Design a binder for this molecule. Structure first.
Ligand SMILES: [Cl-]
Ligand SMILES: [Mg+2]
Ligand SMILES: [Mg+2]
Ligand SMILES: [Mg+2]
Ligand SMILES: [Mg+2]
Ligand SMILES: [Mg+2]
Ligand SMILES: [Mg+2]
Ligand SMILES: [Mg+2]
Ligand SMILES: [Mg+2]
Ligand SMILES: [Mg+2]
Ligand SMILES: [Mg+2]
Ligand SMILES: [Mg+2]
Lengths: 794, 241, 110, 55, 159
């Protein structure tokens, strides 16, 4: 909503300046988005009259004029505008004037003829983009007056955001009424005299949807001149409210919409066949809108039709050929109240958003249509001529909305606000807002005014009292509540603790978009259909991520394009995998993913330049998993994933539960995406590992321990962790430590085989061990590795 | 192309994670329990004078709980603190209620036993406000013990004596052996204590509590000997990662 | 729970977030789930008011639909964007740099 | 991430007042995101939010 | 339950938490220990010769009669304790007060909170891909630069 400050001040003029008024409007709940002057800054421009106008003797398209500005003599001014003529009232930038841009006006010659000033256009004065010609003023414009006084250019266009509540603040009367309340001033309203019909011309009007249209006012105005010019005062009030001047008929209805908040429409009466029928559209009924596009309507959309065809979308948009055209001589003015529930959503369904639809779906004052109809009728005739018939009133009192009677209790008022507001101030506020207030026993009975569509319950009055009393007049006070601890679980593993470990392992956190490019995600997860976004922000951000690798790898490429090869990042966030057994057909799992690439370290004088490999990333994952205390129950199994190297990829398991994946990005996928080199990614299902073992103290042996190293040769395809795990399982009471310290595969072992050097720590809590018991337990582990893996001791 | 197949089960390249001392784990748990109640953590010097450790806590020079206290004295004024109340006295002298502080730290008693060390860790809490009651003392410590041991365990309050509180109490939890186990001492702040720090006992009231960190750590994680805490055997400390 | 508590709690929050006894105003606003509703501004160094918070007293229909009695209970709710507060706190100029994830940008917040 | 720093600071501010952090899915139905917040289907908040709809 | 006001405490983002530093040390392979504040003056005199410590007139024993001038006496004692139990590799840290006589300090004794630690043995445990190498000065300095980097002031640190 944009409006002129001076126009608003014709209804209420508080003794405060422009800045205090805009702040007052914001402090009422109407956030001011901006305050702009209605014209450029300048001086020395006055009204003038072209007393004489002749052809420039040395320039074809120029003219030499004698301009009267009320001085001691007439002025010589050269002008090239095609509308300059011998009777025009114009804006004259005299000598010494400074136009916008510090454009000083001096006496000079243009193509040889003297010019003592300049005739101004709206564009040259910063008023509008109209540079077609010079400004044409009314014939009674005072010659000696500054045009800043005559055109009232010392004005501001105030732009406010109006939330869906406060449907009453979408016109001048509505904003001025609320400003009047805040200033405790009475509202000054213009005298709108009913016109009084001079003809009896009507047409039949039937409302078939009285619930959608409880009131339809039609009026025949016969013999108008649609080509009549809009007066400048109306053109300016339109412009300063953000509306361009089109033609006289729609300028009038737009002026009434801005002045009173009431949308109006004019049909061509000679194109209405039979009469007007206000009815629901038929399912599939088509209508060519005013923009030349076709609308295929549903049976829930209100239309203004005639006896044969639909003419317009009720309270939304007009039709192409039913509206006012160049040869229209008789119109039917429409002024209606449409129920908001019958209008809401229909405009957005067809990509429409008009001044009419915006107001009707929020709520137009249902006591306003007669005053607006008489306002538009008088303005239309005073501008275009013609004669008015009687107002055709089709009002259904049963479906008209009822003003709500709301009880406001002192107790609820004091509890919700926490600050006592005097009884007299509560009654005064509600009455100044338009409520009929009956004071009672510690409660008020208020009947909401007809224009408020946000006054239904007791809390609505609490907000009205509080906002007019002033939010910042309500003091601060801390919450007084109980101090209860809540439920803690030491077995919880904090995600913030895991992020802290990754930071302490050289990882930077990143946050990527949850929707990604499906063309890139199909390269990482081919054949996996992701939940796509109908009508997205872009096709490159239209696929809900099946994992975090698409965003992570995009971040890698993003930084590598800026001369940063070494990238070590992680991200926590949800993945979106379609699943018919999941709620809403989509499973949303919190994931923890990351990627490393480049050298192991930055260039260091003592650390070698080597690229990161699988065991660099796995080591960081073991550090994460070790926070759960269940690292001994973690298994890394070689498993295929289309995005990873098949020989350097692993599925991560925790007590037999798959919790994630890790591996080197496949070289083909690495060459795609244009990765600078070997890159390694992982992703973990967070809630699978968000638990940790609560420690239980175990007895520590006061007796020395023994170390026995064994050389185990197995097939190459035997996972080394299974050998170690089997050693820890068979030795339970004595074997307190199993560690692999060497892996060999070369000269000394057969091809396809490998030797695993394993250390076994043996210790007892009650005695020292001798060679007989040590070798017996060590041999028990060797035969276990021989039974399960067919291993051999070297 | 090339088949650079590796054993993904081999141990990754990393340095082993260290852990926190079990007493530190206990202190951090309790601090987070009371932090959600608006309690601030406050610390202070382990060597105090006889005023903050005794006189400010309503313990005159002729009080039995002074010489018969196993206190490490350096001279007639300086000592190794037996309470963490010194920071509670200084904070109360610098500000008016509301007060909500917990004070962990090391305290010192003389005797050395299988269940007693010359140095141990103690946490003391203090809240001062307008209508703080004994019911609030019971409800706050009951919630704490339920969260610390993570079970609807059976507790009891029992009369006791502390010169800085009146009424005073001790709290026991039903031990696994069928006997009551003293877990903490508490009570309503004595009016002399509030009066000496400029707080009006007719307007404000509060409760205080105190507990040994080693003792609660033993009950929580099943540590049988208190000496293990200060021997710092890496095999013992590694269990609490 | 009262509007005074909503004002006191959010005043406490903003003073600790910016670590400054800064100028704060509450102004009427609208949210479908609160009544009364407010928006909260802070006086920035640029001399203008900056929106940081939307809040209000929980609407009785919200409490009713979740089985809570508005005649017995009341409450307030608030909301805020993390990016905007992050820009005001650390002086970030362009919001898009939060999701470009340039390592030279993220490195500054170690 | 600087956004994470801001989130953690605010959680600790209200955590001292007894506020518990609660999370939920980012894809929700029309009930929990609109109807449960006094935003029926005929309310402009479903369009003023510029909602990403799947169906 | 207590009925009181919900007032937030005083917060300062410029505070660096000791728990955050302990977490980093744990993430660099350090185990936290806690040693006695009174130590053996015979051993402490070997580590800090000539510096007179605050002695206890009636201690539990002469071996626990000197308030520690630093954390090194307790830390190095913990190393020998574990090394005597077949554990050569010892990477530990401790936070705690030192006690240095200071006539300009309260009670004539200055009590500063210290963070100290000690590493020895090989850099890593025996590993199939990591070579056995003894820790050196630049290993411990790197861990300290990681600690100091949390302050954001490592560019102003001199060794
Ligand atoms: Cl027990
Ligand atoms: Mg706007
Ligand atoms: Mg309202
Ligand atoms: Mg653990
Ligand atoms: Mg879980
Ligand atoms: Mg580590
Ligand atoms: Mg007792
Ligand atoms: Mg007992
Ligand atoms: Mg008392
Ligand atoms: Mg034990
Ligand atoms: Mg806004
Ligand atoms: Mg903080």
């Amino acid at each position: 909503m944009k409006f002129s400050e001076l126009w608003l001040r014709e209804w209420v003029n508080p003794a405060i300046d422009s800045d205090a008024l805009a702040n007052q409007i914001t402090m009422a709940g109407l956030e001011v988005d901006g305050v702009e002057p209605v014209a450029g800054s300048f001086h020395g421009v006055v009204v003038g009259e072209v007393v004489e106008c002749a052809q420039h003797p040395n320039a074809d398209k120029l003219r030499v004029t004698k301009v009267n500005v009320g001085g001691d003599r007439l002025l010589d001014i050269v002008c090239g505008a095609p509308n300059c003529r011998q009777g025009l009232r114009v804006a004259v930038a005299t000598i010494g004037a400074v136009l916008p841009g510090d454009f000083k006006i001096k006496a000079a010659k243009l193509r040889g003829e003297p010019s003592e000033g300049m005739l101004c256009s709206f564009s040259e004065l910063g008023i509008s983009d109209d540079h077609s010609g010079i400004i044409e003023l009314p014939a009674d414009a005072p010659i000696g007056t500054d045009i800043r006084e005559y055109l009232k250019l010392d004005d501001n266009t105030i732009e406010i955001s109006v939330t869906p509540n406060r449907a009453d603040c979408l016109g001048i009367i509505g904003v001025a009424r609320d400003v009047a309340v805040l200033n405790q001033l009475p509202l000054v309203q213009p005298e709108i005299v009913p016109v009084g019909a001079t003809i009896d011309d009507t047409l039949p009007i039937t409302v078939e949807a009285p619930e959608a249209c409880p009131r339809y006012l039609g009026r025949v105005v016969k013999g108008i001149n649609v080509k009549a010019p809009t007066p400048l005062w109306m053109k300016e009030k339109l412009r300063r409210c953000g509306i361009r001047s089109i033609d006289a008929v729609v300028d009038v209805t737009n002026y009434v919409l801005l002045e009173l908040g009431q949308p109006m429409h004019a049909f061509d009466k000679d194109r209405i066949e039979g009469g007007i029928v206000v009815r629901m559209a038929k399912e599939g009924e088509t209508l060519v809108l005013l923009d030349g596009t076709e609308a295929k309507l549903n049976a829930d959309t209100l239309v203004i039709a005639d006896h044969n065809k639909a003419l317009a979308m009720g309270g939304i948009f007009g039709g192409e050929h039913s509206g006012v055209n160049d040869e229209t001589q008789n119109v039917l003015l429409e002024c209606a109240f449409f129920s908001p529930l019958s209008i809401t959503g229909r405009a957005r369904r067809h990509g429409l958003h008009t001044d009419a639809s915006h107001r009707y779906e929020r709520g137009v004052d249902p006591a306003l249509q007669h005053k607006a109809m008489e306002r538009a009728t008088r303005l239309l005739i005073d501008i275009c001529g013609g004669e008015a018939g009687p107002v055709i009133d089709i009002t259904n009192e049963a479906t008209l909305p009822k003003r709500a009677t709301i009880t406001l209790r002192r107790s609820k008022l004091d509890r919700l606000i926490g600050h006592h507001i005097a009884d007299e101030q509560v009654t005064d506020i509600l009455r100044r807002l338009g409520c009929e207030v009956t004071e009672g026993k510690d409660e008020w009975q208020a009947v909401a005014p007809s224009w408020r569509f946000d006054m239904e319950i007791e809390e609505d009055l609490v907000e009205e009292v509080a906002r007019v009393y002033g939010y910042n007049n309500i003091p601060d006070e801390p919450v007084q509540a109980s101090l209860i601890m809540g439920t803690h679980r030491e077995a919880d593993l904090s995600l913030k603790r895991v992020k802290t470990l990754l930071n302490d392992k050289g990882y930077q956190e990143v946050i990527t978009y949850s929707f990604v490019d499906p063309k890139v995600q199909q390269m990482i997860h081919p054949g996996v259909e992701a939940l796509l976004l109908p009508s997205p922000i872009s096709v490159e951000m239209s696929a809900m991520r099946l994992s975090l690798w698409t965003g992570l790898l995009a971040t890698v490429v993003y930084n590598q394009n800026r001369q940063q090869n070494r990238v070590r990042i992680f991200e926590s966030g949800l993945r979106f995998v379609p699943d018919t057994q999941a709620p809403l057909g989509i499973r949303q799992d919190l994931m923890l993913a990351g990627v490393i690439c480049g050298n192991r370290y930055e260039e260091h004088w003592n650390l070698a330049k080597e690229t990161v490999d699988f065991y660099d990333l796995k080591g960081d994952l073991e550090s994460v998993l070790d926070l759960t205390g269940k690292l001994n129950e973690v298994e890394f199994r070689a498993e295929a994933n289309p995005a990873l190297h098949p020989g350097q990829s692993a599925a991560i398991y925790l007590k037999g539960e798959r919790i994630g994946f890790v591996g080197v990005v496949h070289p083909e996928l690495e060459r795609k995406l244009d990765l600078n080199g070997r890159t390694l990614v992982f992703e973990l299902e967070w809630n699978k590992l968000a638990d940790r073992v609560v420690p239980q103290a175990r007895e520590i042996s006061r007796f020395p321990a023994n170390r026995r190293d064994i050389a185990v040769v197995v097939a190459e395809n035997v996972p080394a962790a299974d050998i170690l795990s089997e050693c820890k399982k068979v030795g339970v009471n004595q074997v307190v430590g199993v560690n692999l310290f060497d892996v060999y595969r070369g000269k000394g072992v057969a091809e396809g085989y490998k030797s695993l050097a394993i250390s076994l720590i043996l210790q007892d809590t009650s005695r020292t061990l001798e060679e007989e018991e040590i070798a017996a337990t060590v041999a028990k582990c060797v035969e276990a590795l021989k039974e399960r893996f067919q291993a051999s001791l070297r | 192309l090339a088949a650079e197949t590796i054993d993904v089960s081999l141990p990754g390249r990393r340095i082993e994670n260290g852990g926190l001392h079990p007493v530190t784990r206990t202190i951090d748990r309790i601090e987070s329990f009371f932090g959600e109640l608006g309690f601030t953590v406050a610390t202070g010097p382990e060597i105090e004078d006889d005023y903050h450790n005794f006189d400010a806590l309503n313990i005159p020079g002729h009080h039995p709980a002074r010489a018969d206290h196993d206190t490490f004295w350096f001279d007639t004024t300086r000592l190794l603190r037996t309470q963490t109340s010194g920071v509670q006295i200084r904070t109360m002298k610098a500000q008016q209620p509301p007060i909500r502080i917990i004070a962990p730290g090391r305290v010192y008693r003389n005797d050395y036993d299988q269940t007693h060390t010359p140095m141990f860790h103690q946490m003391e809490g203090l809240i001062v406000d307008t209508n703080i009651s004994f019911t609030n003392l019971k409800g706050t410590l009951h919630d704490f013990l339920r969260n610390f041991f993570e079970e609807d365990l059976q507790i009891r309050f029992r009369p006791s004596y502390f010169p800085f509180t009146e009424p005073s109490a001790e709290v026991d939890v039903m031990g696994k052996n069928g006997k009551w186990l003293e877990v903490l001492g508490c009570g309503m702040v004595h009016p002399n204590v509030l009066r000496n720090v400029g707080i009006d006992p007719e307007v404000y009231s509060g409760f205080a509590f105190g507990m040994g960190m080693e003792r609660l750590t033993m009950l929580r994680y099943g540590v049988t000997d208190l000496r293990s805490f200060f021997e710092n055997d890496l095999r013992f400390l590694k269990q609490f990662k």
